[PDB]
Ligand binder design. Structure first.
Ligand SMILES: NC(=O)c1ccc[n+]([C@@H]2O[C@H](COP(=O)([O-])OP(=O)(O)OC[C@H]3O[C@@H](n4cnc5c(N)ncnc54)[C@H](OP(=O)(O)O)[C@@H]3O)[C@@H](O)[C@H]2O)c1
Ligand SMILES: CCc1nc(N)nc(N)c1C#C[C@H](C)c1cc(OC)cc(-c2ccncc2)c1
Length: 159
């Protein structure tokens, strides 16, 4: 099964100047919890935004250049990227925007972190039709010491 996991600011902003315009440890924990023991897939600039694989996970990145790296599996499209996962129950897509867009029709579940902050960004999460998803899980958290802005964790499923 395919799923997308993302942190969304106000009006769906996900990134600015090859980075994320916030720092939330709670959402980091949520990310780590739901991406654990699952394979992850990302685009080039995101991989380059990290530069180091996720521990004990099968890391897959999508591109049009030769693998500049041997510690990760390189793929050039969507359907063979799924075949690059094998016989798995759940596949994780962690970004970014164009990957989100291409896999959103493929995705059957959405792990969304709703960040309550309006901030600046060049990249957005694909507009999904709220007609197409329903919320099975909603967990709201106000901002605190470690968390600069409030946030709400949500799990969506297709219909
Ligand atoms: N808040 C969040 O949840 C979060 C999480 C992750 C990332 N982000 C942010 O979002 C931004 C990244 O998103 P993005 O839209 O810029 O890029 P992206 O989707 O992560 O990466 C796209 C890259 O992957 C390659 N690619 C994608 N599909 C391909 C295909 N079908 N065939 C061949 N290559 C393909 C493309 O290069 P080529 O096609 O030329 O090879 C392209 O350069 C970053 O700024 C990051 O900081 C935010
Ligand atoms: C807030 C992070 C985050 N939060 C939520 N709720 N969803 C997400 N999808 C992401 C994210 C992300 C990006 C794609 C990412 C890619 C990556 O590709 C290797 C490694 C990491 C990462 C390696 C180690 N420690 C922290 C993050 C993050």
């Amino acid at each position: 099964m395919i799923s997308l996991i993302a942190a969304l600011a106000v009006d769906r902003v996900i990134g600015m100047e090859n980075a994320m315009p916030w720092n939330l440890p709670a959402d980091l924990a949520w990310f780590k919890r739901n991406t654990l023991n699952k394979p992850v897939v990302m685009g080039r600039l995101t991989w380059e935004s990290i530069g180091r694989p996720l521990p004990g996970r099968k890391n897959i990145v999508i591109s049009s250049k030769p693998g500049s790296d041997d510690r990760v599996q390189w793929v050039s499209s969507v359907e063979e990227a799924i075949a690059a996962c094998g016989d798995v129950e759940e596949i994780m897509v962690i970004g970014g925007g164009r990957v989100y867009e291409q896999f959103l029709p493929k995705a059957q579940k959405l792990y969304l972190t709703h960040i309550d902050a309006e901030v600046e960004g060049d990249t957005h999460f694909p507009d999904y039709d709220p007609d197409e998803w329903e919320s099975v899980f909603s967990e709201f958290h106000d901002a605190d010491a470690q968390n600069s802005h409030s946030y709400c964790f949500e799990i969506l499923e297709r219909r």
